[PDB]
Amino acid sequence: KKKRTNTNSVDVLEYFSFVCGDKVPNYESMGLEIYIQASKKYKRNSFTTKVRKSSTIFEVIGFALFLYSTEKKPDNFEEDGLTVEDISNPNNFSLKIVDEDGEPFEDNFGKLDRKSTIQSISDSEVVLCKVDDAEKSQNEIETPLP
Amino acid sequence: FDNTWYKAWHNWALANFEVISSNLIHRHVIPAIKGFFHSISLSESSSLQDALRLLTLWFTFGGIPEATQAMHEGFNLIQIGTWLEVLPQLISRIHQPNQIVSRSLLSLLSDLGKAHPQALVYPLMVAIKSESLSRQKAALSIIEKMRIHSPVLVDQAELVSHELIRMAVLWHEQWYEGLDDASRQFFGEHNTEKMFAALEPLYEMLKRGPETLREISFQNSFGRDLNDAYEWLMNYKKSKDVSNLNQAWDIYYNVFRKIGKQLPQLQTLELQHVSPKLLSAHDLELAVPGTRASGGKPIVKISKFEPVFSVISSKQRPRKFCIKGSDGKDYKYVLKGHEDIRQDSLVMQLFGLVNTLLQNDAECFRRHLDIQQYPAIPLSPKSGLLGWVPNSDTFHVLIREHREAKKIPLNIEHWVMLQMAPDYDNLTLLQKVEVFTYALNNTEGQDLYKVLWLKSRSSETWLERRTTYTRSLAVMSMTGYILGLGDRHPSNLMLDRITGKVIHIDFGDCFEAAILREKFPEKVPFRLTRMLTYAMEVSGIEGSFRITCENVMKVLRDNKGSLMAILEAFAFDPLINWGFDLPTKKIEEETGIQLPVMNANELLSNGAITEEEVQRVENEHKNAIRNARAMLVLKRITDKLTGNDIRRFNDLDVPEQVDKLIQQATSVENLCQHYIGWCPFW
Amino acid sequence: VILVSAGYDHTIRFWEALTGVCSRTIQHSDSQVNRLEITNDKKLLATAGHQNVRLYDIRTTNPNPVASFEGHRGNVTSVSFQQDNRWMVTSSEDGTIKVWDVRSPSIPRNYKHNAPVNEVVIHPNQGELISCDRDGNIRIWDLGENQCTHQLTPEDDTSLQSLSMASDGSMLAAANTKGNCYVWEMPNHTDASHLKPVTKFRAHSTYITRILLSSDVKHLATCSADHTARVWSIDDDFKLETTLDGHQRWVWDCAFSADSAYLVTASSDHYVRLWDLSTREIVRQYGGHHKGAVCVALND
Amino acid sequence: ELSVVGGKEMTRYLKELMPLIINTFQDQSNSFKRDAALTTLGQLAASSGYVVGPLLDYPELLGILINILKTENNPHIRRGTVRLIGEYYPTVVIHNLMKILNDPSLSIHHTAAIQAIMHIFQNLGLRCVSFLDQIIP
Amino acid sequence: NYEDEMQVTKLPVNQNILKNAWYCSQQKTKEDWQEWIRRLSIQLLKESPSACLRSCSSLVSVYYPLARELFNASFSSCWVELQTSYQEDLVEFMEHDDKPLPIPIHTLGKYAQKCHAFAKALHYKEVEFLEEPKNSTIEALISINNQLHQTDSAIGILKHAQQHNELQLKETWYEKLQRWEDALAAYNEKEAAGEDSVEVMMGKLRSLYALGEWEELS
């Protein structure tokens, strides 16, 4: 294809490989603690095997700048400046009973990829700064703080 | 038959002047105004206002030699003098199509613009940087006069016009940010042969290249190749356009990832590295880079300033501090970048209206104030030289040092909105009213007191900096309404760290904020951030709105008749304010009210060529998207604050122009609505 | 039985109005809370987005959108269903009163208001729509004519939040945002119908949300920002029948079940109360809410 | 000059008044006749020196106002005459000492050297509290 | 290496005991007070501000910043002390405490002025005028601000609180006619003030004078 060189898809949506067709894109279903239904949770725009669950939320500047509604979590909990994963949101492990597993934030986040739990149905955890210091400190290569 | 009181008897030369706008013979009988303007150009008539209508709404008539010999030679009897003002208007009015009496007045302006270009020449320092083509040729042959009139002063200010246009912002961040959006819609649209020359005119430029030592080289020395992978998009687009698809597929890419990795090193510069040319001026005469006001001062030099500047601090990036003026006086400046100094010249002109009509006023002149001509020249028609912003502190850092000293976030509102509201997205008017009046009852902004009240330092500098400001909400409060630009953003709502006086800064757009902005039709005079506009003064704008009742009443009627006509020639502001002031009330709710005052479509397809120029439609329709938005200051200064809008016509006088603001910073929720700039601070 | 709904909390909890517990337990997002009513057939209920109708077949508990219907800027001001049930006739925050066949995904007709429609309802004659405009103009839009006029302004410039007509054709009753509840009187007709002035009230001294003139048309259950769940009978009792207050209530409509003896306080206070209108006493208070409730569905 | 030496006489003041209070007869005051009457406002503040409140009242500062004949026309343009007049807080004071003690006419210049070595025992001290003071001290 | 200087501290009991001994007598406190502000000079043990005010020149102007040094340091210690915070009884040292340690003398702050009557504290009174704009504190604010001549907002908060706060009676007819305002209605506030004991009320008599006319007072 060209589906790599449009608007925000050289400034923000570069590492994603769009010319590459769907497995060099394995997609992503993020769902809030303000998913207050279970039917429109964050369906944009996959994983390049290469870029992490640092993908993902920075597409919540790139799900808030290709469906005009799932609100813009501001702006300093997304990301700082449009590269990688959410220093107050992780991803957390899904099981198979839709139990919102708070504690074992080290399968999908920044440490490894979000091609680390095979499934194109996960929820997430709330941060009370227990979650912010054993995840930005494992992530000084996956929060590119330019 | 005159022989008395000649100013009021010139309110006459003006009913014949406005009425007759060949017919007695009137080609004569113009002579009522033309010799009687010469009775009032005394000084009480300084009004340049009605002097332009004579040479403006005569530049339009032209006509027979009574043109110069009895009218313009009637001026050449007195003198320039007062044409220190309106010279940026005279460097816009450059083709007038009769040149034969007007080169001849442009010759005359070569003499007018040869005496005090020594001050200005700076309207010709701009002029030669943009085209005006056949009428910039006149501007270039008027340089012949400047090259006779000490070529020492004009060549120094030229050295730098250039050395600042050669320095202006960067070059390699600028060229790689003017490729960033160009061949982007050329790639995924296609624009094809449109943005085929939005990187071609950047090539030119790096024609001089590995140019100045350690920056216009360190980016083309290891940028020797930052050309070789353009000329594959050149040839073979001539020939394959899906085989060589794959080149704006690449060259696009490579240097972007470099641009960000190149935006955290764009602040501390040199100058040994880009301009060691502005390094080596050391001292020119003929700087006057912000003095230019009178001469008591005698033309400040530049005795410079840091090789190593300190840049803004925004996206735009035009080096803000101070460039040492020799009048031992550091010249305050923030250059201006890729812009328009006929907006900030009309932003000084119109601060020149207005403080001369703040001098003229009643009490309100013993208790006198005046809103501060902000120091700016146009470096390009797209650039400038601004002026340090002189003490202050703007409502974003002005709500910081509260919440700094107080330690309670700006989020808490938008986080007491992430608590009350999911946020405002969807949340119609009784709702946005709702989660307004719970993220407020809670909320308190006693801050303007508390920050007052740190200085204070008489326990009455509290009073003295306010009882300065109190009258300084009032003035540019009523100012920022009847005009426009209200601009709600906390960089606009600047406080003073000096006196506490009205600072607008970052001047948006000539017309008002409701039919703007689409981040809500925000309709308010301006804001009530209320306890920062309340705990400032006793009862929330009541001794202060006593004082908006002073300004409004005064500036409702004090000569509002004219005043108006040549504030309307901002009706037709030739090039910059044509240009920047149509696509003024923001064109996002405008173009659209009358597409079919006239025609536009089905005459641009049926003539062989009649689209180029078609004018009428579209260029005198952009002059009638103007004369249907401009008749519409004039019909928005006669039924709202003489001042038109609502249901409630007549005039609305003091009380009803007094409530048209208490209605609109309480009614209604319309004070709520704006957002990123509204930033709902009690 | 059915009701419902949610407020800021965004918790489509259907409970039953003749019982005590919870019918139908679905959290709500991706928009408010404009609309959570059961559709004329009372089965494909709208839960409402950016004009999203996603009709969740009250009978089958917890679904999946079944029949979108999306597409118009803003949010469906009100999803009336031209009882044909053939026509949805959505009055959105957009403006354009299209006029959805809610049995085919398309917009068959159009007519523009310049001053974000405020009110919509159907007269039940199929030849009517008595579509209202933030100016207030009740512009009588008949469903087979494209008529602006007939247009009449009850109160100029203050928005008509809320038009309630009757099932007859013997009223209306029209209350503006200011909470000034002009009562007009319809020659039950088709296409024309002349509005003829009984009584502007004071709604409310405060702000109206929507005055339904009952299933009965006997009351006028006038609910407000100031928390009151007032009912006002039809004849002369357009003079106070009730002031029903409460705590952050901001009850945002009314409903009448199937004898005008149950008022429902849709309030952001946590509670959707099924009171006892003629009896003014909370008979049935629902906890099924993180925070508030807005508008609202009581098809017995 | 007689405004400057009007102490060192009162008579150099009073007589200066009669060569305005009798130039008043024909000529007008407003010229400087505003500043020679504002150097009077001086020196009228400072009526505690130009000995009309202190020494003897000397029937004087009231031959002042009506010698400008300020009768029927007294306001306005005073505005045209504002025209003619043109923490480590413990270490802001550890200096406010040395700011004040910098006095030329000191009783003992040993109470500007006694008090200095009471900062030089000391902050001399932090060699940053010498290049801030002991370049200017 | 220089800077062997804690150097700043030291609290003064005994010494707050010797201030407690001389507050009965002095009562023109500026003599034995200033003696003792040489002893509130002695910060600690040694300093540059301590053996400093052993100076012979000792001026009241070094003594004022140095009367907060053995006091922001021994200060919040009620040891003798804030037991002797007010006594005590030319009053202008106070104003540097102030914005950043507060001190009580607010309600009595009529006392934060009556010692010098001026009504210098238009901001520790303006902190009590918004605290609660009381029915008698709004008009006491219409009084001490005709002094500051801020009437231009004391006919603000008199035209605001005649509109807003209730609807008042004796300060409204007297700052309306001060001033065209109520000229002949402050005189029609003689036709509803020939019942209020006309005589002294000068709102009803002035627009006969405020304004010739002298015929209504002949």
Residue numbers in the entry:
A (entry chain J): 647 to 792
B (entry chain C): 1751 to 1771, 1814 to 2474
C (entry chain D): 3 to 302
D (entry chain C): 785 to 870, 915 to 965
E (entry chain C): 1207 to 1295, 1321 to 1449
Per the authors:
From N-terminus to C-terminus, Tor contains two blocks of HEAT (Huntingtin, EF3A, ATM, TOR) repeats, a block of TPR (tetratricopeptide) repeats known as the FAT (Frap, ATM, TRRAP) domain, and the kinase domain, which includes the FRB domain inserted in its N-terminal part and the FAT C-terminal (FATC) domain19,31.
In agreement with previous structures, Lst8 is bound to the catalytic kinase domain and positioned at the obtuse angle of the rhombohedron, clearly sticking out from the central part of the complex. Specifically, in Sc TORC2, the dimer interface is mediated by four contacts between helices Nα25, 27, 29 of the spiral of Tor2 in one protomer, and helices Nα44, 46, 48, 50 of the bridge of Tor2 in the second protomer. We built a homology model for Avo239 and placed it into the density corresponding to Finger3, which shows clear alpha-helical features. In our model, Avo3 contacts the bridge of Tor2 (helices Nα46,48,50) in the same protomer and the spiral of Tor2 (helices Nα27 and Nα29) in the other protomer. This is the molecular basis of TORC2’s insensitivity to rapamycin.
